[PDB]
Coordinates of C-alpha atoms and ligand atoms in Angstrom, one line a residue:
Chain A
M1 CA -151.3 57.8 -120.3
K2 CA -151.3 61.3 -119.3
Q3 CA -148.5 61.2 -116.7
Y4 CA -146.4 59.1 -119.1
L5 CA -146.8 61.4 -122.0
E6 CA -145.9 64.5 -119.7
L7 CA -142.6 62.7 -118.8
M8 CA -141.9 62.1 -122.4
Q9 CA -142.6 65.8 -123.3
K10 CA -140.4 66.9 -120.2
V11 CA -137.4 64.8 -121.3
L12 CA -137.5 66.4 -124.8
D13 CA -138.0 69.8 -123.4
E14 CA -135.6 69.6 -120.5
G15 CA -133.2 66.7 -121.1
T16 CA -129.6 67.4 -121.4
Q17 CA -127.5 65.6 -123.8
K18 CA -125.7 62.7 -122.2
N19 CA -123.7 59.8 -123.4
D20 CA -124.2 56.5 -122.2
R21 CA -122.3 53.0 -122.1
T22 CA -123.6 51.9 -125.5
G23 CA -122.1 55.1 -127.2
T24 CA -125.6 56.2 -128.5
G25 CA -126.6 59.7 -127.0
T26 CA -129.4 60.2 -124.5
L27 CA -131.5 63.0 -123.4
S28 CA -131.5 62.8 -119.8
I29 CA -133.2 64.3 -116.7
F30 CA -132.3 63.3 -113.0
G31 CA -135.2 62.9 -110.5
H32 CA -138.8 62.6 -111.5
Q33 CA -142.0 61.2 -109.8
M34 CA -145.4 60.2 -111.0
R35 CA -148.3 58.7 -109.2
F36 CA -151.1 56.2 -110.4
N37 CA -154.2 55.7 -108.4
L38 CA -154.7 52.2 -109.1
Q39 CA -158.4 52.5 -108.5
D40 CA -158.7 54.6 -111.6
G41 CA -157.6 51.5 -113.7
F42 CA -154.7 49.3 -114.8
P43 CA -151.7 51.6 -115.9
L44 CA -151.0 50.0 -119.3
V45 CA -149.8 52.4 -121.8
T46 CA -152.7 52.9 -124.3
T47 CA -150.8 55.3 -126.9
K48 CA -148.9 52.3 -128.2
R49 CA -149.7 48.6 -127.9
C50 CA -148.1 46.7 -125.1
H51 CA -147.9 42.9 -125.1
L52 CA -148.7 42.1 -121.3
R53 CA -147.9 38.4 -121.9
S54 CA -144.2 39.1 -121.4
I55 CA -144.7 41.3 -118.3
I56 CA -146.7 38.6 -116.5
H57 CA -144.4 35.7 -117.3
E58 CA -141.4 38.0 -116.2
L59 CA -143.1 38.8 -112.8
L60 CA -144.0 35.2 -112.1
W61 CA -140.3 34.4 -113.0
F62 CA -139.1 37.0 -110.5
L63 CA -141.3 35.6 -107.8
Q64 CA -139.9 32.1 -108.3
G65 CA -136.2 33.3 -107.4
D66 CA -135.1 31.8 -110.6
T67 CA -132.5 33.7 -112.5
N68 CA -132.0 31.1 -115.4
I69 CA -134.0 32.0 -118.6
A70 CA -135.2 28.3 -119.0
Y71 CA -138.8 29.2 -117.5
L72 CA -139.1 32.2 -119.9
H73 CA -138.1 29.8 -122.7
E74 CA -140.6 27.2 -122.1
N75 CA -143.2 30.1 -122.6
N76 CA -141.3 31.7 -125.6
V77 CA -140.5 34.7 -123.8
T78 CA -137.1 36.1 -125.2
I79 CA -136.8 39.5 -123.4
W80 CA -133.7 38.4 -121.3
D81 CA -131.9 36.4 -124.1
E82 CA -129.4 39.3 -125.0
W83 CA -128.0 39.3 -121.4
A84 CA -128.0 35.4 -120.7
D85 CA -124.9 33.3 -121.0
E86 CA -124.9 30.0 -122.9
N87 CA -126.4 28.1 -120.0
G88 CA -129.2 30.8 -119.9
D89 CA -127.8 32.1 -116.6
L90 CA -128.1 35.8 -115.7
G91 CA -126.3 35.7 -112.4
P92 CA -128.0 36.7 -109.0
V93 CA -130.3 39.4 -110.6
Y94 CA -133.8 40.4 -109.2
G95 CA -135.4 37.2 -108.4
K96 CA -132.6 35.7 -106.5
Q97 CA -132.3 38.9 -104.3
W98 CA -136.1 39.1 -103.6
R99 CA -136.4 35.4 -102.6
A100 CA -132.9 34.6 -101.5
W101 CA -130.6 37.6 -100.4
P102 CA -127.3 35.9 -99.2
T103 CA -126.1 37.0 -95.8
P104 CA -122.5 37.0 -94.7
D105 CA -123.4 34.2 -92.2
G106 CA -125.0 31.7 -94.6
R107 CA -128.5 32.6 -94.6
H108 CA -130.8 33.4 -97.5
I109 CA -133.4 36.0 -96.9
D110 CA -136.8 35.9 -98.4
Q111 CA -137.7 39.6 -98.8
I112 CA -141.0 38.7 -100.6
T113 CA -142.4 36.5 -97.6
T114 CA -140.9 39.1 -95.0
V115 CA -143.0 41.9 -96.7
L116 CA -146.2 39.7 -96.5
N117 CA -145.6 39.1 -92.8
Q118 CA -145.3 42.9 -92.2
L119 CA -148.3 43.7 -94.4
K120 CA -150.4 41.2 -92.4
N121 CA -149.0 41.7 -88.8
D122 CA -147.6 45.3 -88.7
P123 CA -149.2 47.2 -91.6
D124 CA -148.1 50.6 -90.0
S125 CA -144.5 49.8 -90.4
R126 CA -142.4 52.3 -92.2
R127 CA -139.8 49.5 -93.0
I128 CA -141.7 47.4 -95.4
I129 CA -139.1 47.1 -98.2
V130 CA -137.6 44.9 -100.9
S131 CA -134.2 45.8 -102.2
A132 CA -132.4 44.2 -105.3
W133 CA -129.4 46.4 -104.6
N134 CA -127.1 43.8 -103.0
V135 CA -123.7 45.6 -103.2
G136 CA -121.7 42.5 -102.7
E137 CA -123.3 40.6 -105.5
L138 CA -123.4 43.4 -108.2
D139 CA -120.4 42.2 -109.9
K140 CA -121.9 38.8 -110.8
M141 CA -125.2 40.2 -112.2
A142 CA -125.3 40.5 -116.1
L143 CA -126.4 44.0 -115.2
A144 CA -127.1 46.1 -112.2
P145 CA -130.9 46.3 -111.3
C146 CA -132.8 49.3 -112.9
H147 CA -135.8 49.0 -110.7
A148 CA -133.8 48.7 -107.5
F149 CA -135.6 49.3 -104.4
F150 CA -139.2 49.4 -103.4
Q151 CA -141.4 50.2 -100.4
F152 CA -145.0 49.3 -99.4
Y153 CA -147.4 51.5 -97.4
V154 CA -150.8 50.8 -95.8
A155 CA -153.3 53.6 -94.8
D156 CA -157.0 53.2 -94.7
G157 CA -157.2 49.6 -96.0
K158 CA -155.3 50.7 -99.1
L159 CA -152.0 49.1 -100.3
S160 CA -149.6 51.7 -101.9
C161 CA -146.0 51.0 -103.4
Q162 CA -143.1 53.3 -104.2
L163 CA -140.4 52.1 -106.8
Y164 CA -137.0 53.8 -106.8
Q165 CA -135.8 53.2 -110.4
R166 CA -132.1 54.2 -110.7
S167 CA -132.2 54.3 -114.6
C168 CA -135.0 54.3 -116.9
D169 CA -135.3 54.2 -120.8
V170 CA -138.6 56.1 -121.1
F171 CA -139.5 54.6 -124.3
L172 CA -138.7 50.9 -124.3
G173 CA -138.4 50.3 -120.4
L174 CA -140.8 52.4 -118.6
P175 CA -144.2 51.2 -120.0
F176 CA -143.1 47.8 -118.9
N177 CA -141.9 48.6 -115.5
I178 CA -145.1 50.4 -114.5
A179 CA -147.4 47.5 -115.4
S180 CA -145.2 45.0 -113.8
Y181 CA -145.1 46.8 -110.4
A182 CA -149.1 47.6 -110.5
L183 CA -149.5 44.0 -111.1
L184 CA -147.4 43.2 -108.0
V185 CA -149.5 45.7 -105.9
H186 CA -152.7 43.8 -107.0
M187 CA -151.3 40.4 -106.2
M188 CA -149.9 41.6 -102.8
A189 CA -153.3 43.6 -102.0
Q190 CA -155.2 40.3 -102.8
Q191 CA -153.1 38.0 -100.5
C192 CA -153.3 40.5 -97.6
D193 CA -157.0 41.4 -98.0
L194 CA -156.3 45.1 -98.8
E195 CA -157.5 47.5 -101.5
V196 CA -155.2 48.8 -103.9
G197 CA -153.9 52.2 -103.4
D198 CA -151.3 54.3 -105.3
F199 CA -148.3 53.2 -107.3
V200 CA -145.6 55.9 -107.0
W201 CA -142.7 55.8 -109.7
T202 CA -139.6 57.7 -108.7
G203 CA -136.8 58.0 -111.3
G204 CA -133.0 58.5 -111.1
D205 CA -131.5 59.0 -114.7
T206 CA -134.7 59.1 -116.8
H207 CA -133.7 59.1 -120.4
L208 CA -134.9 58.8 -124.1
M209 CA -132.4 57.2 -126.5
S210 CA -131.3 59.9 -129.3
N211 CA -132.3 57.5 -132.1
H212 CA -135.7 57.4 -130.7
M213 CA -136.8 61.1 -131.5
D214 CA -139.1 60.0 -134.3
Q215 CA -140.9 57.3 -132.4
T216 CA -141.4 59.7 -129.4
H217 CA -142.8 62.5 -131.7
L218 CA -145.1 59.9 -133.1
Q219 CA -146.4 58.7 -129.8
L220 CA -146.7 62.3 -128.4
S221 CA -149.3 63.0 -131.2
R222 CA -151.6 60.2 -130.0
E223 CA -154.5 60.6 -127.6
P224 CA -154.5 58.5 -124.4
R225 CA -157.5 56.1 -124.4
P226 CA -159.4 55.1 -121.0
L227 CA -157.3 52.8 -118.7
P228 CA -158.2 49.0 -118.7
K229 CA -159.4 47.1 -115.7
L230 CA -157.3 44.1 -114.3
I231 CA -159.2 41.1 -113.5
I232 CA -157.7 38.2 -111.2
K233 CA -159.8 35.1 -111.9
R234 CA -158.9 33.3 -108.6
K235 CA -157.3 33.8 -105.2
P236 CA -154.3 31.3 -104.9
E237 CA -153.3 30.1 -101.3
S238 CA -149.8 31.9 -101.7
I239 CA -148.2 34.8 -103.7
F240 CA -146.0 32.0 -105.2
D241 CA -149.0 30.1 -106.6
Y242 CA -150.2 32.6 -109.3
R243 CA -150.3 31.3 -112.8
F244 CA -150.4 33.1 -116.3
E245 CA -154.0 32.4 -116.8
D246 CA -155.1 34.0 -113.5
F247 CA -154.8 37.4 -115.1
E248 CA -157.2 39.1 -117.5
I249 CA -157.1 42.7 -118.9
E250 CA -160.5 44.1 -119.8
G251 CA -161.2 47.1 -122.0
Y252 CA -157.7 47.5 -123.5
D253 CA -157.8 49.4 -126.7
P254 CA -154.3 50.7 -127.5
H255 CA -153.0 52.7 -130.5
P256 CA -150.8 50.6 -132.8
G257 CA -147.4 49.3 -131.7
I258 CA -144.2 51.4 -132.3
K259 CA -140.9 49.5 -132.9
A260 CA -137.9 51.2 -131.4
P261 CA -134.5 49.9 -132.7
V262 CA -131.5 49.7 -130.6
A263 CA -127.8 50.1 -131.3
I264 CA -125.3 47.3 -130.7
Chain B
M1 CA -137.5 77.2 -96.9
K2 CA -140.2 77.5 -99.4
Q3 CA -140.2 73.8 -100.5
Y4 CA -140.1 72.6 -97.0
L5 CA -143.0 74.9 -95.8
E6 CA -145.0 73.6 -98.7
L7 CA -144.4 70.1 -97.8
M8 CA -145.3 70.9 -94.0
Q9 CA -148.7 72.4 -95.3
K10 CA -149.3 69.4 -97.6
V11 CA -149.0 66.9 -94.6
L12 CA -151.4 68.9 -92.5
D13 CA -153.8 69.2 -95.5
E14 CA -153.5 65.9 -96.9
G15 CA -152.0 63.5 -94.2
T16 CA -154.1 60.5 -93.2
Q17 CA -154.0 59.6 -89.2
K18 CA -151.6 56.9 -89.0
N19 CA -150.4 55.1 -85.9
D20 CA -146.7 54.7 -85.4
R21 CA -144.5 52.4 -83.3
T22 CA -144.3 54.7 -80.6
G23 CA -148.1 54.8 -80.1
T24 CA -148.2 58.6 -80.9
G25 CA -150.4 59.5 -83.9
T26 CA -148.9 60.9 -86.9
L27 CA -150.3 62.5 -90.0
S28 CA -148.7 60.8 -92.9
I29 CA -148.3 61.1 -96.9
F30 CA -146.6 58.6 -98.9
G31 CA -144.3 59.5 -101.7
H32 CA -143.1 63.2 -102.1
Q33 CA -140.2 64.8 -104.0
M34 CA -138.5 68.1 -103.6
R35 CA -135.6 69.7 -105.4
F36 CA -132.8 72.2 -104.3
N37 CA -130.5 73.9 -106.6
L38 CA -127.5 74.0 -104.6
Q39 CA -126.1 77.0 -106.5
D40 CA -129.1 79.1 -105.1
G41 CA -127.5 78.5 -101.6
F42 CA -127.2 76.2 -98.8
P43 CA -130.4 74.5 -98.0
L44 CA -130.5 75.2 -94.1
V45 CA -133.9 75.9 -92.6
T46 CA -134.3 79.7 -91.8
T47 CA -137.7 79.5 -90.3
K48 CA -136.3 78.0 -87.3
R49 CA -132.7 78.0 -86.0
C50 CA -130.8 74.8 -86.7
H51 CA -127.5 74.1 -85.1
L52 CA -125.2 72.9 -87.9
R53 CA -122.4 71.8 -85.4
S54 CA -124.2 68.4 -84.9
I55 CA -124.9 67.9 -88.7
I56 CA -121.3 68.3 -89.4
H57 CA -119.8 66.1 -86.8
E58 CA -122.5 63.3 -87.4
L59 CA -121.5 63.3 -91.2
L60 CA -117.7 63.2 -90.4
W61 CA -118.4 60.2 -88.1
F62 CA -120.5 58.5 -91.0
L63 CA -117.5 58.9 -93.3
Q64 CA -115.0 57.4 -90.7
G65 CA -117.2 54.1 -90.8
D66 CA -117.4 54.5 -87.1
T67 CA -120.7 53.0 -85.4
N68 CA -119.7 53.8 -81.9
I69 CA -120.6 57.2 -80.4
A70 CA -117.3 57.7 -78.7
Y71 CA -116.2 60.2 -81.4
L72 CA -119.5 62.0 -81.1
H73 CA -119.0 62.4 -77.2
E74 CA -115.4 63.7 -77.6
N75 CA -117.2 66.6 -79.2
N76 CA -120.3 66.8 -76.9
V77 CA -122.6 65.7 -79.6
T78 CA -125.5 63.5 -78.0
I79 CA -128.0 63.1 -80.8
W80 CA -127.4 59.2 -81.0
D81 CA -127.4 58.5 -77.2
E82 CA -130.9 57.4 -77.0
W83 CA -130.2 54.5 -79.3
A84 CA -126.6 53.5 -78.1
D85 CA -126.0 50.6 -75.8
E86 CA -123.9 50.7 -72.6
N87 CA -120.6 50.6 -74.6
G88 CA -121.9 53.3 -77.1
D89 CA -122.5 50.9 -79.9
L90 CA -125.3 51.3 -82.3
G91 CA -124.8 48.3 -84.4
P92 CA -123.7 48.3 -88.1
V93 CA -125.7 51.4 -89.0
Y94 CA -124.9 54.1 -91.7
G95 CA -121.1 54.5 -91.6
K96 CA -120.5 50.8 -91.4
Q97 CA -122.5 50.3 -94.6
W98 CA -121.1 53.2 -96.4
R99 CA -117.5 52.2 -95.8
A100 CA -117.4 48.5 -95.1
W101 CA -120.3 46.7 -96.3
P102 CA -119.9 42.9 -95.7
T103 CA -120.3 40.4 -98.4
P104 CA -120.9 36.7 -97.9
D105 CA -117.2 35.9 -99.1
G106 CA -115.5 37.9 -96.4
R107 CA -115.0 41.3 -98.1
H108 CA -115.9 44.8 -96.9
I109 CA -116.9 47.0 -99.7
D110 CA -116.0 50.7 -99.3
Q111 CA -119.1 52.3 -101.2
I112 CA -117.6 55.9 -100.7
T113 CA -114.4 55.2 -102.4
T114 CA -116.4 53.2 -105.1
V115 CA -118.5 56.5 -105.9
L116 CA -115.4 58.6 -106.1
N117 CA -113.8 56.2 -108.5
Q118 CA -116.9 56.3 -110.6
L119 CA -117.3 60.0 -110.4
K120 CA -113.7 60.5 -111.6
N121 CA -113.5 57.6 -114.2
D122 CA -117.1 57.1 -115.3
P123 CA -119.1 60.1 -114.7
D124 CA -121.9 59.1 -117.1
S125 CA -122.6 56.0 -115.1
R126 CA -126.3 55.4 -114.2
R127 CA -125.0 53.2 -111.3
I128 CA -123.3 55.5 -108.9
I129 CA -125.0 54.5 -105.8
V130 CA -124.6 54.2 -102.1
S131 CA -127.0 51.9 -100.2
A132 CA -127.3 51.7 -96.3
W133 CA -130.1 49.1 -96.7
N134 CA -128.1 45.9 -95.9
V135 CA -130.9 43.2 -95.5
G136 CA -128.7 40.6 -93.8
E137 CA -127.5 43.2 -91.1
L138 CA -130.9 45.0 -90.4
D139 CA -131.7 42.8 -87.2
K140 CA -128.3 43.9 -85.7
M141 CA -128.9 47.8 -86.1
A142 CA -130.3 49.9 -83.3
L143 CA -132.7 51.1 -86.1
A144 CA -133.2 50.6 -89.6
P145 CA -131.8 53.5 -91.8
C146 CA -134.2 56.3 -92.5
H147 CA -132.1 57.8 -95.3
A148 CA -131.5 54.5 -97.0
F149 CA -130.3 54.8 -100.5
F150 CA -128.7 57.6 -102.7
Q151 CA -127.6 58.1 -106.2
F152 CA -125.2 60.6 -107.7
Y153 CA -125.4 62.0 -111.3
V154 CA -123.3 64.1 -113.5
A155 CA -124.4 66.3 -116.3
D156 CA -122.6 69.4 -117.8
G157 CA -119.9 69.6 -114.9
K158 CA -122.5 69.6 -112.2
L159 CA -123.0 66.8 -109.4
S160 CA -126.4 66.2 -108.5
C161 CA -127.5 63.6 -105.8
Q162 CA -131.0 62.0 -105.1
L163 CA -131.8 60.5 -101.6
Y164 CA -134.6 57.9 -101.1
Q165 CA -135.6 58.5 -97.4
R166 CA -137.9 55.6 -96.5
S167 CA -139.4 57.4 -93.4
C168 CA -139.4 61.1 -92.5
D169 CA -140.2 63.0 -89.4
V170 CA -140.9 66.4 -91.2
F171 CA -140.4 68.5 -88.1
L172 CA -137.5 67.1 -86.4
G173 CA -135.8 64.8 -88.9
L174 CA -135.9 66.5 -92.3
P175 CA -134.2 70.0 -91.7
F176 CA -131.3 67.9 -90.6
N177 CA -131.4 65.3 -93.3
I178 CA -131.3 67.9 -96.2
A179 CA -128.3 69.9 -94.7
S180 CA -126.4 66.7 -94.2
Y181 CA -126.8 65.5 -97.8
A182 CA -126.2 68.9 -99.2
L183 CA -122.9 69.1 -97.3
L184 CA -121.9 65.6 -98.7
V185 CA -122.6 66.7 -102.3
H186 CA -120.3 69.8 -101.8
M187 CA -117.6 67.7 -100.3
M188 CA -117.9 65.1 -103.2
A189 CA -118.1 68.0 -105.8
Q190 CA -114.9 69.4 -104.3
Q191 CA -112.9 66.2 -104.4
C192 CA -114.1 65.4 -108.0
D193 CA -113.4 69.0 -109.4
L194 CA -117.2 69.4 -110.4
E195 CA -119.6 72.0 -109.6
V196 CA -122.6 71.5 -107.5
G197 CA -126.0 70.8 -109.0
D198 CA -129.3 69.8 -107.5
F199 CA -130.2 67.7 -104.4
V200 CA -133.4 65.8 -105.0
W201 CA -135.1 64.6 -101.8
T202 CA -137.6 61.7 -102.2
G203 CA -139.7 60.5 -99.3
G204 CA -141.5 57.3 -98.3
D205 CA -143.7 57.8 -95.1
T206 CA -143.4 61.5 -94.6
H207 CA -145.1 62.5 -91.5
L208 CA -145.7 65.1 -88.6
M209 CA -146.0 63.8 -85.1
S210 CA -149.5 64.5 -83.8
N211 CA -148.1 66.3 -80.7
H212 CA -146.3 68.8 -83.0
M213 CA -149.5 70.5 -84.3
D214 CA -148.7 73.9 -82.3
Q215 CA -145.1 74.1 -83.4
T216 CA -146.0 73.3 -87.0
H217 CA -148.6 76.1 -87.1
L218 CA -146.1 78.4 -85.4
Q219 CA -143.4 77.7 -88.1
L220 CA -145.8 77.9 -91.1
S221 CA -146.5 81.5 -90.0
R222 CA -142.9 82.5 -90.4
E223 CA -141.4 84.0 -93.6
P224 CA -138.3 82.1 -95.2
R225 CA -135.2 84.3 -95.1
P226 CA -132.6 84.3 -97.9
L227 CA -130.4 80.9 -97.9
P228 CA -127.1 81.1 -96.5
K229 CA -123.9 80.3 -98.4
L230 CA -121.5 77.3 -97.5
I231 CA -117.9 78.0 -97.5
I232 CA -115.1 75.3 -97.5
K233 CA -111.9 76.8 -96.1
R234 CA -109.4 74.3 -97.7
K235 CA -109.4 71.2 -100.0
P236 CA -108.2 68.2 -98.2
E237 CA -106.4 65.5 -100.0
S238 CA -109.1 62.9 -99.4
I239 CA -113.0 62.8 -98.7
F240 CA -111.8 61.2 -95.4
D241 CA -109.6 64.1 -94.3
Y242 CA -112.3 66.8 -93.5
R243 CA -112.3 68.4 -90.2
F244 CA -114.9 70.1 -88.4
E245 CA -113.3 73.6 -88.9
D246 CA -113.1 73.4 -92.5
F247 CA -116.8 74.4 -92.9
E248 CA -118.3 77.9 -92.6
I249 CA -121.8 79.0 -93.1
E250 CA -122.2 82.7 -94.1
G251 CA -125.3 84.8 -94.2
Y252 CA -127.4 82.6 -91.8
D253 CA -130.1 84.6 -90.1
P254 CA -132.8 82.2 -88.7
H255 CA -136.0 82.9 -86.9
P256 CA -135.9 81.5 -83.3
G257 CA -135.4 77.9 -82.4
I258 CA -138.5 75.8 -81.8
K259 CA -138.5 72.9 -79.4
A260 CA -140.6 69.7 -80.3
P261 CA -141.0 67.3 -77.5
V262 CA -141.2 63.5 -77.9
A263 CA -143.2 60.8 -76.3
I264 CA -141.4 57.9 -74.7
Ligands
NDU301 O1 -136.4 47.1 -116.4 C1 -135.5 47.8 -116.9 N1 -136.0 49.1 -117.1 C2 -135.0 50.1 -117.8 O2 -135.6 51.2 -118.0 N2 -133.8 49.6 -118.0 C3 -132.9 50.6 -118.8 C4 -132.3 51.8 -118.2 C5 -131.1 51.9 -119.2 O3 -131.5 52.5 -120.5 C6 -130.5 50.4 -119.3 C7 -129.7 49.9 -118.2 O4 -128.4 50.4 -118.4 P1 -127.6 51.0 -117.3 O5 -128.4 52.1 -116.7 O6 -126.4 51.5 -117.8 O7 -127.3 49.8 -116.5 O8 -131.8 49.6 -119.5 C8 -133.1 48.6 -117.4 C9 -134.0 47.5 -117.2 N3 -133.7 46.2 -116.9 O9 -132.5 45.9 -117.2 O10 -134.4 45.3 -116.5
NDU302 O1 -132.2 60.7 -90.0 C1 -133.5 60.3 -89.6 N1 -134.6 61.0 -90.1 C2 -135.7 60.9 -89.8 O2 -136.7 61.4 -90.2 N2 -136.0 59.7 -88.9 C3 -137.3 59.5 -88.3 C4 -138.5 58.9 -89.3 C5 -139.4 58.3 -88.2 O3 -140.0 59.4 -87.4 C6 -138.1 57.7 -87.2 C7 -137.7 56.3 -87.4 O4 -138.9 55.3 -87.2 P1 -139.1 54.1 -88.0 O5 -139.5 54.6 -89.4 O6 -140.5 53.5 -87.4 O7 -137.9 53.3 -88.1 O8 -137.3 58.5 -87.2 C8 -134.9 58.8 -88.8 C9 -133.7 59.2 -88.6 N3 -132.5 58.4 -88.2 O9 -133.0 57.3 -87.4 O10 -131.5 58.6 -88.3

C-alpha cells in the first residue's frame, strides 16, 4: 500500500542506527501516523502475499480473553510459539487485559463490552478506549504489548479507530497489525450498526531490522495493486460469537511472498 | 506557533459538528500529529499570551503524586478548582498514577522513577512508557485523563517524547499541554545527561468549542513571533527536587491574551 511503502522509504531515508535488545541493528524513526479510509477497501498489503488466516485466528483468540496458545494450536497457528512456555502460557498478555483487566479490589474489567456499551449508548464520548498497558502486570507478560492502546470515535454514522503502537517492526509486524485492527473495526461497526470510517495508525519506535535491507529494497520496487474487499458472511448476536468462516476477502491479488529471517 | 495555527485552521476547515457532554457543539477531527524540535526553542504559543506560572506549578504538583489541590492553593493556582470536591480532592488523577499506580497485589508503582532508571541503564528500550490510563481507577477520578499515555525515546544523545492525548480542546487546553510536556522533557534530559530532541504530540478527538469561533478567527490573524528559550537555573539532585524558581523563560514576546468563555 501506498501509505505503507512511503513509511518503508521514510525509515530507509531518515532512520537512525539504533541497537535493539536482540543485538541486531535497526534503522528507527520515532513518531509516525498514517490513515486508511476503510471505505476505500481492506488494508491488506498487496506488495507481498499476507496469509490472513493467522490474523483472523489471533484476533478471535484475543477476543476470547485466552492467553494460552492451545486454541491457536487446534488451528495450527504457530505465530505465538516462540514466546509460550512449556504449558503454552504467555502470561496476562493482550486478550487477558482486553477482557479481564484486574483491579486492586478484586474485579476484572471487560474493556471490549465497555466499549460496545459506549458506542451504542454514548457515541460522542471522547473516552472510548481499550488499553493493554497494565503497568502492574507487565512483569508477568512474555513481552510488553506492542499495540498498546486504542481509541474509538463516532462521527456521522462512521466508526473510526486510532491505535498507538509503541514499537513496530515495519517489515514483519506492521502488515499484520493493520489488518488485525481493520478487521476489529469492521466487527465493531457491524455490531453497533455503524459504517466503517478511518483506521489511524500511530507509531512510536518504528523500525526496520538491519538484516532486512534486501527484502525492503525488493518490496519497494513493487507496485501496489488495488485493495481487496472484506466480506462478513453473517451477523452474530455478539462480538464474541464470530467464527473463522464468517470472513471472506475478495479481490486479493498480491505480489509473491517475501521471507524475512530473524536473528536469535 | 506555526504547527498550532495549522491545526487550528484544519479543525475549522475539516471539523465535523459533534456534540459533547457539556451540550455545546464542537468542531472535531480525529487523529492528528505534530512535532516540535525542542532545539528550535520552547514551544510556548506566542499568538496569545500564556501564563507559564500555572503550567509549572501543575507539573511540579503532578511529580509530587499529590492529587489534593492544597499545594496549588498555597500558590494561588486555581485551574483545578472546578473539579475538586469540598476537601480539595480530585480522586486518583494524573500524579497518583505517575508516582503510585496501584497493583492488585498491594504494590504502588513509581512510573517516573522507572522511566529514569530505563533512560539511564537501557536507553534503547522501546518500552519507556508512563500511562495515566488506569482502567480500574477511572470511576474514582474527577475526570478521565486527557493526556493519557506517553513514551520516551533516545537516539544520538537526544531525548524525544511522544504524548497520546485522547481528547483536546485546541483553544484552551492544547497550548498548556504542549508547554507542560516540553518542560518535562527538559527536566528528564537534564537528569539523564541527554540533549533534548523532539516532542511529538498525537491527538484523538481534537476539537474547538463552537462558542470559540471569534477567538479562533482573531488568533488565526496573528503572526507567530520567534519561540522563547527555556533556562534551568540549577541542576537538582532528583527529578522530584525542582522548584518553581529554577525555571526562566527568555525572549517571550506574545500577542495579547484572548479570553475564551465556557458554558456550564
Ligand atoms: O504485534 C506486534 N508488532 C510488532 O511490530 N512487534 C515488534 C516490535 C519490535 O520489533 C518487537 C518487540 O520488541 P520490544 O519493542 O523490544 O518489546 O516486536 C511486536 C508485536 N507483538 O509482540 O505482538
Ligand atoms: O489537559 C487537558 N487538556 C484538554 O484539552 N482537556 C479537554 C479535552 C476536552 O475538551 C475536556 C475533557 O472532556 P472529556 O474528553 O469529555 O473528558 O477537556 C482535558 C484536560 N484535562 O482535564 O486536564
